Design a protein around this ligand. Structure first.
Ligand SMILES: [Mg+2]
Ligand SMILES: [Zn+2]
Ligand SMILES: [Zn+2]
Lengths: 76, 100, 309, 1154, 174
């Protein structure tokens, strides 16, 4: 469920980087390359990404770190 | 006729009828009344007065457009008549119904 | 004062020359004849030219001052008769070709008439030149008055039909039916329908619609040669389905079926070519493809493919 | 992909390089088999195939043969879409001038050659000759002869004489001239000349020559020798049903050009006389002009109908051109429209969407879900299911839209809140249901209004709709900070009815254990909804951070206010519900909730307020009857007394004492007094007359009259309307302005007689016509404001500037018109703010003044606070977030990337229909008043010189500095100051309205911005509108965007060159690295139309105002438009550099500067 | 009225005349309902009686050679149904009456909206039913200017001179 984004905006700020990071993460879930980090509540990937942002589990820094480590482990 | 009536009323003439074309008297009297309005006691005509705005209905407008068709057929009639004949033309070939 | 009207400028420039004086056109034709005669004397006095003329005669059976006098007296005649063109070009003013265009086509006709005029006939120049000027103007209207050009013969047919319809409109009272023009005219009555169907002048795409504010005709016209997104997606899905169905076929049967139709390759091959590549008889490839199509006809193997129908 | 757009002149070689062939014939289609003709305007060899990968002749009908050109017809085989890209050309047999470069006013051809446009047009239309370097013996190069003079000099001069006619002569002149030597000679003239008109002419000529010789342009290219031809698919000749064809006007114009060019070729072949050839060249020139512009030639040529043909230029310029009809706005897929109903059950974040509308709008999503969940094997099958509307298609549709927002938009989008995102709830109907609390933002009523729904498709669009546009995020106005989701009329009436108290009400006096007891008592009928009772109530206070201390107390309230108290959230005081709760109280309560608790509690509170207000307005049974409009019993007496006074004054006039006009004015005054008396009696009789008794003699209480309660609560109506209902409806003024001496004495409860109704229609129609003809100019003003400020974005976080503006309360006539609290709320202080006694630093330097700091300032009575302003920011290409302030839509400081210019334009413009407005238009256009103020140009002692007809020369002399500045002041201008005095700079000498230019020039940027903001705010305040000054200051900063170089010094600029202020700022910054600067400027002030039209981008300036001028200037100057603007990116379909795309744009720069 | 006003015609320099006698309206081919169904204009044919009178050469008295009297068809005029409507292409149409400026002379000085000081510049305008407009106006310098069909301004006395008036009699009049 989702009504307002004030905790996610708080946790990321600028009200515009929140959209971009949430879009990155929602596309990550939408394509079969990632799984939700919070218990799915029948939500769409956009709302799931927002709920992960609110929890603090997703940031622009977390996402790029995970992308980098996935690249590094791709070498294997 | 309405135009002549209004023209003669605006110049305080006592003839409600007249002619359809302008004259020296008409033009000079219009100039004289304009001058009088400039200095004497003259009232600007109210354009929105309903005594100055006329009503055109379907009959009048249709007559006007029929007369337009008639003039643009008479042009051709006159041009054809430019060469008069005796027994080769009839009043059915000199007039074309398409313009009207 | 000043004007921007090209027709007014043309009138200004042309009207300067006095119209003419009788027996002046004869003298102008005489001067033209003198000029051409000077050129002819130049050509006849050239021995090589005469030798060439003899050579070409055998083949068939088997100056500057002269030109100047010709160019002049052609300028004088054409400029002396520019008012003749305008009188008999203002007749056609509103036939889809502007006034100055008609004037110019009539001017070219007048130039031709000057070239072909013969004074020894003792005939007034206007009588002859009127034919040429009218021909030029009328053929110009026939040739470049419509967006979709129709030939001159079809325009003559159209004009004859219009004249006869106009006459019958008054001789009958209401209008002639296309069957009724097969009696007044002598046409199979199918040509009448074709001539009547011939497209009228195209409608401007900027035509206001009754509102006349912002609705133009071009706002109601769709791109007919466009692929609907559903059609394109269906094409992609059908390509994928054919791939995934041909996958479930023996190697040579699948290859044969991919070759016989241009399936993700170049132009389709013929049975003879496939034999040229499989090194087998043509009838063998025919039997192979028939069996492959039979196998593809199986249920639980083409239910999605028939869903594509 | 592409960084900038370059515009320049086109050479014949370039036009040929574009071309794929030469259009040689005017033919289009074959009239029997409608295939294209061989070399005509629709040609397969030149322009491409008409069917996909199908050769015209028929020898090649497969994709396999792609890439070969046929032999039986020579037609390339490719896609048909290439028909939209392939251009042709026409080889003109006679050069023809480009109409734009000859008829630009100023004429580029005329100005470049220093030849008057009259002379050039005379030469062009074969009326006169022009010498072309025709010997340096007797006739000069630029001299023009006529037929007489040319023939005279013919026999007098055979050689060393060149005088030609028409456009070939103009081309020869333009090609024989050399730009550098002309520029040098004109520079010498400019440097050795003293005359402002001739000086200005020389500056203009030099600028044209320099901007021409710097760019690759050659002047001769302004004469068209090769004509480009548009691709056929952009000038289609399609078939209409029935054998008819629809064609573009460009086909007809091109056919005329081709016909006349071919006739000219024929004539030159025949060696026709010069008169005929000249006429044909004139006709060809006219045809090319018509094709290019179909104007600038006296008479436009009309088509088969009597309507002028639409030209190549007409398809770019105007309200109907490409720029505004197809590039700045568009028709859009995935969109619907329907009538709006109310649906008062909705939550603030959702809207009712019809099931059929949703099924059509989400079709691809439904197809995808049908395929994915296995319910359809192929997409065609899924389409068939959706067509049949099978039972499971609706389940799929429910799954699809579960959290997919949709944008709702009402037709006139006057500001941001005209588009808002909502979560769809599917309704079995055909009308969109709209939450009642967003109607005010939409300015939407439910009497037939429609709304458009747009589907956001991508994940980014969906997240933007959720996190930026959602109706729950937009609860404060972006113009002022005030809430925008306040309950409007029925909710206000219900809350007002439930909160006000009666004197003797069932259940009065009893003591309650809480709001639940009050609700139980009322709902069980034992107590009246508003009975004065005591009740134990538990407030929560959030004095410090986080902690909510509970305070339980016995309050003296009503049953209704106790019931309402359950709706209120925790951290709010009880006193907010212990009043009568009109419209103002509810708005203030929502604002308090937002500023204390936050956004989520405020949204929940707003929904609960709406539900409760609807419920209790229903229970109230509030109605309107004829008895509810009570007429004063004294109305008859008052009108009789006024009529008697009128008769008395009429007699006095008849006595030869007072002129008719003065008598009329006295009658007006007495009638106005009588109207005021009647209205006062009506309000006294209708507001508190209700009298009842409470266990005693009698008491008095406010009336429960339904009309009165509607007017007092603020739900609907006002004292003016109530008086028009019961008391007389005052005096009527005829649309001229004269007040009809006989006023309408009848109200509407009693009828109006025929004369009174006629008089009333006089003004009703005037109002309707005025409002119909007002929004046009208000919309034009908003368009100009948006165009001037579109390229303004918050790019930095802090510029670091110390300069600001001093905000003080506005006082006029000894009363405050707007306090300091509302002027300084949300603005960052520029310099440390001390107490009046200088005791200590009251608030630090760069604090954002929220309502707590404002409360402190109010408590300590600080009159002037210096706050940062957008107009004094140091940021290049944008403004920092600390100079803007609070982002009034939110509470936090403005974010980086916010397009504050668009918000400023919309905030200023959307109230313009409430306006007057022409005053604001004048202020933003910076028009000079008709009889301005003569201000003191310089400081010094004033004296008089010559005072003859050349009006008085006034001389102001500084103490030490030179005084060559003397002013030519008229005598009929009343001097404010004496002859022998001393005056300070920017002072007033004559009297009159001060022109904004002079205020800027003499007093400064702060002075002019203060003038503009104060005047426009005066207009809006007079009209009751509330706009923050941030927006007006944004517009003013955009007006102050240019500067003239008073002394170039060691900079790379000229003297009179009006440079962009940011460029000169960066230049003066860089030259500080060196020693020499010598670069000094005067700031200019242009109107919004003039400031937005004179901008760096030629696309953004061509896109809104006159396109021919902008395009011609950018073509001759060779302008290169780097996009760097909202309009430019909107046109080319890229992420605007403002919002969520700002980051993207920054990233692009990161890659571009490497 | 239309026929009488323009239909009689004389062959310029030929003196061959075509004159109008009478007209009649033929019966409509279809009724109103049939026109609505098929889709046609409820119209009546116009049959005009014309007479081509040929004048014998050199007959200024009026002697005519022959007269050819024939009835001819001149288009079909749409008819008005019983309730004031026209069916034009099967669809019922209404022609709305027009309120237009009446022909005559009108004096319509501007209200001082032209020049500074709000000076009232008076003008007269002759509006015909058919023909060109004839305006007289005043300039701020107190001069009288004639203007024809709203073109460039001219001094008023030009028209007076064009009417064969000399200066002396012009001043005598004014
Ligand atoms: Mg409405
Ligand atoms: Zn071919
Ligand atoms: Zn700043």
């Amino acid at each position: 469920a989702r009504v307002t984004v004030q905790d996610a905006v708080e946790k990321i700020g600028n009200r515009f980087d929140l959209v971009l990071v949430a879009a990155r993460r929602a596309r990550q879930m939408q394509v079969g390359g990632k799984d939700p980090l919070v218990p799915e509540e029948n939500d769409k990937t956009t709302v799931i990404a927002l709920r992960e942002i609110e929890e603090g589990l997703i940031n622009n820094q977390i996402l790029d770190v995970r992308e980098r480590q996935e690249q590094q482990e791709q070498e294997a | 006729a309405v135009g002549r009536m209004k023209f003669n009323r605006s110049l305080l003439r006592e003839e409600i009828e007249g002619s359809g074309i302008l004259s020296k008297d008409d033009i000079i009297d219009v100039m004289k009344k304009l001058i009088d309005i400039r200095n004497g006691k003259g009232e600007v005509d109210d354009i929105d007065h309903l005594g100055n705005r006329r009503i055109r209905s379907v009959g009048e407008m249709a007559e006007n457009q029929f007369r337009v068709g008639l003039v643009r057929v008479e042009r051709a009639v006159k041009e054809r008549l430019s060469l008069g004949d005796l027994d080769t033309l009839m009043p059915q070939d000199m007039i074309n119904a398409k313009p009207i | 004062g000043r004007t921007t009207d090209p027709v007014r400028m043309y009138m200004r420039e042309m009207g300067t020359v006095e119209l003419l004086t009788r027996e002046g056109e004869i003298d102008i034709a005489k001067r033209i004849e003198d000029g051409i005669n000077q050129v002819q004397c130049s050509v006849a006095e050239y021995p090589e030219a005469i030798t060439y003329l003899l050579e070409q005669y055998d083949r068939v059976e088997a100056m500057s001052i002269g030109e100047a006098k010709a160019r002049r007296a052609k300028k004088e005649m054409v400029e002396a008769n520019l008012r003749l063109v305008i009188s008999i070009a203002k007749k056609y003013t509103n036939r889809g070709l502007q006034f100055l265009d008609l004037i110019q086509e009539g001017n070219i006709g007048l130039m031709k008439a000057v070239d072909k005029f013969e004074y020894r006939r003792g005939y007034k120049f206007s009588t002859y030149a009127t034919w040429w000027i009218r021909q030029a103007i009328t053929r110009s209207i026939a040739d470049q008055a419509r967006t979709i050009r129709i030939p001159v013969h079809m325009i003559e047919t159209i004009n004859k039909l219009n004249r006869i319809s106009r006459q019958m409109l008054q001789e009958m009272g209401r209008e002639p039916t296309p069957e009724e023009l097969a009696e007044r005219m002598l046409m199979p009555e199918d040509k009448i329908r074709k001539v009547l169907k011939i497209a009228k002048e195209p409608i401007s795409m900027e035509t206001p619609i009754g509102d006349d504010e912002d609705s133009h005709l071009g706002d109601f016209i769709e791109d007919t040669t466009l692929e609907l997104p559903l059609d394109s997606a269906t094409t992609e899905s059908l390509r994928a389905a054919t791939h995934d169905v041909l996958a479930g076929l023996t190697a040579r049967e699948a290859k044969v079926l991919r070759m016989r139709f241009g399936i993700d390759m170049n132009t389709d091959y013929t049975l003879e070519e496939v034999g040229k590549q499989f090194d087998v008889t043509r009838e063998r490839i025919r039997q192979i493809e028939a069996k492959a199509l039979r196998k593809l006809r199986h249920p639980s193997r083409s239910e999605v493919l028939r869903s594509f129908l | 992909e592409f960084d900038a757009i370059k515009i320049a002149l086109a050479s014949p070689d370039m036009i040929r390089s574009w071309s794929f062939g030469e259009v040689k014939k005017p033919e289009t289609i074959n009239y029997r088999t409608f295939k294209p003709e061989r070399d005509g305007l629709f040609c397969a060899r030149i322009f491409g195939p008409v069917k996909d990968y199908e050769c015209l002749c028929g020898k090649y009908k497969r994709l396999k043969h792609r890439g070969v050109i046929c032999e039986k017809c020579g037609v390339e085989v490719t896609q048909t879409k290439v028909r939209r890209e392939r251009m042709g050309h026409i080889e003109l047999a006679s050069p023809t001038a480009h109409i734009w470069f000859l008829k630009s006013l100023p004429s580029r051809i005329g100005l470049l050659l220093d030849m008057p446009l009259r002379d050039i047009e005379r030469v062009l239309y074969f009326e006169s000759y022009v010498v072309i370097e025709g010997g340096m013996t007797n006739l000069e190069r630029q001299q023009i002869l006529t037929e007489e003079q040319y023939l005279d000099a013919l026999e007098e001069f055979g050689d060393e004489f060149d005088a030609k006619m028409g456009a070939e002569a103009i081309q020869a002149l333009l090609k024989s001239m050399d730009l550098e030597q002309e520029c040098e000679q004109l520079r010498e003239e400019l440097n050795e000349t003293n005359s402002e008109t001739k000086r200005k002419k020389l500056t203009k000529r030099i600028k044209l020559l320099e901007a021409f010789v710097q760019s690759g342009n050659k002047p001769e290219w302004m004469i068209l020798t090769v004509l480009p031809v548009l691709p056929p698919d952009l000038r289609p000749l399609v078939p209409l049903d029935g054998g008819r064809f629809a064609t573009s006007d460009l086909n007809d114009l091109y056919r005329r050009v081709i016909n006349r060019n071919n006739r000219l070729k024929r004539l030159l072949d025949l060696a026709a006389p010069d008169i005929i050839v000249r006429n044909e060249k004139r006709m060809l020139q006219e045809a090319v002009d018509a094709l290019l512009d179909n104007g600038r030639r006296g008479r436009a040529i009309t088509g088969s109908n009597k309507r002028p043909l639409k030209s190549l230029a007409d398809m770019i310029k105007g309200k109907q051109g490409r720029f505004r009809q197809n590039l700045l706005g568009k028709r859009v897929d995935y969109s619907g429209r329907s009538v709006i109903t109310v649906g008062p059950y909705l939550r603030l974040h959702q809207c009712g969407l019809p099931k059929k509308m949703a099924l059509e709008l989400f079709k691809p999503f439904i197809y995808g879900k049908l395929e994915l969940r296995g319910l359809a094997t192929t997409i065609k099958a899924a389409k068939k299911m959706v067509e049949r509307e099978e039972a499971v298609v609706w389940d799929i549709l429910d799954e699809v839209i579960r959290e997919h927002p949709v944008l709702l938009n009402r037709a006139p989008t006057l500001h941001r809140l005209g588009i808002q995102a909502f979560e769809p709830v599917l309704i079995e109907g055909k009308a969109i249901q709209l939450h009642p609390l967003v109607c005010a933002a939409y300015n939407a009523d439910f009497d037939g209004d429609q709304m458009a729904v747009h589907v956001p498709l991508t994940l980014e669009a969906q997240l933007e709709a959720r996190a930026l546009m959602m109706s729950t995020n937009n609860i404060l106005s972006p113009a002022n900070g005030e809430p925008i989701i306040v309950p409007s009329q029925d909710v206000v009436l219900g809350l007002y009815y439930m909160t006000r108290d009666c004197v003797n009400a069932k259940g009065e006096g009893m003591v309650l254990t809480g709001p639940k007891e009050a609700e139980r008592l009322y709902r069980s009928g034992l107590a009246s909804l508003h009975a004065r009772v005591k009740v134990r109530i538990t407030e929560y206070e959030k004095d410090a951070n986080g902690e909510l201390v509970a305070k339980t107390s016995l309050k003296d309230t009503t049953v209704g206010r106790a019931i309402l108290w359950m709706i209120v959230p925790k951290g709010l005081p009880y006193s907010i519900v212990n009043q009568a709760l009109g419209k103002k109280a509810i708005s203030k309560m929502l604002n308090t909730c937002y500023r204390i608790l936050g956004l989520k509690p405020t949204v929940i509170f707003a929904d609960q307020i709406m539900y409760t207000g609807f419920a209790y307005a229903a229970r109230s049974g509030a109605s309107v009857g004829i008895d509810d409009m009570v007429i004063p019993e004294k109305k008859h007496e008052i009108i009789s007394e006024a009529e008697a006074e009128v008769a008395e004054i009429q007699e006095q006039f008849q006595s030869g004492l007072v002129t008719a006009g003065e008598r009329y004015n006295k009658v007006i005054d007495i009638w106005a007094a009588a109207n005021d008396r009647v209205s006062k009696a009506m309000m006294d009789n209708l507001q508190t007359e209700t009298v009842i008794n409470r266990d005693g003699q009698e008491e008095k209480q406010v009336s429960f009259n339904s009309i009165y309660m509607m007017a007092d609560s603020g739900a609907r109506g006002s004292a003016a309307q109530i008086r028009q209902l019961a008391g007389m409806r005052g005096l009527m003024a005829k649309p001229d302005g004269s007040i009809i001496e006989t006023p309408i004495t009848a109200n509407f409860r009693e009828g109006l007689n025929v004369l009174q109704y006629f008089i009333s229609t006089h003004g009703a129609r005037k109002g309707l016509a005025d409002t119909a003809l007002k929004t046009a100019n208000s919309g034009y003003l908003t368009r100009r404001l948006v165009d001037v400020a579109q390229d303004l974005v918050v790019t930095e976080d802090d510029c670091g500037t110390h300069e600001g503006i001093m905000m003080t309360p506005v006082i006029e006539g000894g009363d405050v018109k707007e306090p300091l609290r509302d002027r300084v709320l949300g603005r960052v202080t520029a310099e440390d703010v001390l107490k009046p006694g200088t005791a200590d630093i009251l608030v630090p330097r760069n604090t954002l003044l929220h309502e707590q700091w404002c409360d402190l300032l109010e408590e300590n009575s600080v009159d002037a606070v210096k706050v940062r302003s957008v107009v004094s920011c140091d940021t290049d290409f944008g403004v920092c977030a600390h100079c803007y302030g609070r982002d009034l839509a939110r509470g936090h400081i403005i974010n980086k990337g916010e397009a504050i210019g668009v918000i400023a334009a919309q905030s200023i413009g959307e109230p313009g229909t409430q306006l007057g407005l022409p005053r604001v238009a004048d202020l933003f256009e910076a028009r000079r008043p008709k009889e301005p103020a003569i201000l003191a140009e310089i400081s010094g002692i004033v004296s008089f010189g010559k005072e003859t007809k050349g009006k008085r020369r006034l001389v102001i002399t500084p103490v030490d500095g030179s005084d060559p500045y003397e002013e030519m002041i008229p005598k009929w201008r009343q001097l404010n100051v004496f002859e022998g005095e001393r005056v300070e700079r920017g002072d007033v000498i004559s009297d009159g309205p001060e022109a904004p230019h002079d205020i800027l020039r003499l007093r400064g940027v702060h002075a002019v911005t203060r003038y503009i903001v104060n005047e426009v705010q005066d207009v809006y305040r007079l009209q009751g509108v509330k706009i923050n000054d941030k927006h007006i200051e944004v517009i003013v900063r955009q007006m102050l965007r240019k500067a003239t170089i008073v002394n170039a010094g060691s900079s790379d600029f000229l003297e009179g060159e009006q440079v962009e202020y940011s460029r000169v700022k960066i230049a003066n910054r860089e030259l500080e690295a060196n020693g020499k600067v010598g670069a000094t400027y005067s700031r200019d002030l242009l109107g919004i139309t003039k400031a937005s039209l004179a901008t760096e981008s030629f696309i953004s300036a061509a896109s809104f105002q006159e396109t021919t001028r902008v395009l011609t200037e950018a073509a001759v100057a060779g302008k290169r438009d780097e996009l760097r603007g909202l309009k430019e990116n909107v046109i080319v379909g890229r992420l605007i550099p403002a919002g969520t795309g700002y980051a993207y744009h920054q990233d692009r720069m990161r890659r571009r500067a490497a | 009225a239309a026929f009488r006003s323009v239909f009689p015609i004389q062959s310029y320099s030929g003196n061959s005349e075509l004159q109008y006698v009478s007209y009649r309206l033929g019966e409509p081919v279809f009724d109103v309902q049939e026109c609505q169904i098929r889709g046609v204009t409820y119209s009546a044919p116009l049959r005009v009686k014309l007479r081509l009178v040929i004048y014998e050469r050199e007959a200024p008295e009026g002697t005519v050679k022959d007269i050819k009297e024939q009835e001819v068809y001149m288009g079909e005029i749409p008819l008005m149904t019983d309730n004031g409507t026209f069916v034009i292409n099967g669809t019922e149409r209404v022609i709305v009456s027009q309120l237009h400026r009446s022909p005559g002379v009108f004096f319509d000085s501007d209200k001082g909206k032209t020049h500074s000081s709000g000076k009232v510049l008076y003008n007269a305008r002759i509006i015909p039913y058919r023909g060109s407009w004839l305006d007289f106006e005043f300039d701020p310098k107190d001069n009288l200017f004639v203007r024809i069909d709203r073109r460039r301004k001219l001094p008023a006395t030009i028209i007076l001179r064009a009417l064969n008036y000399t200066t002396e009699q012009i001043l005598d009049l004014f």
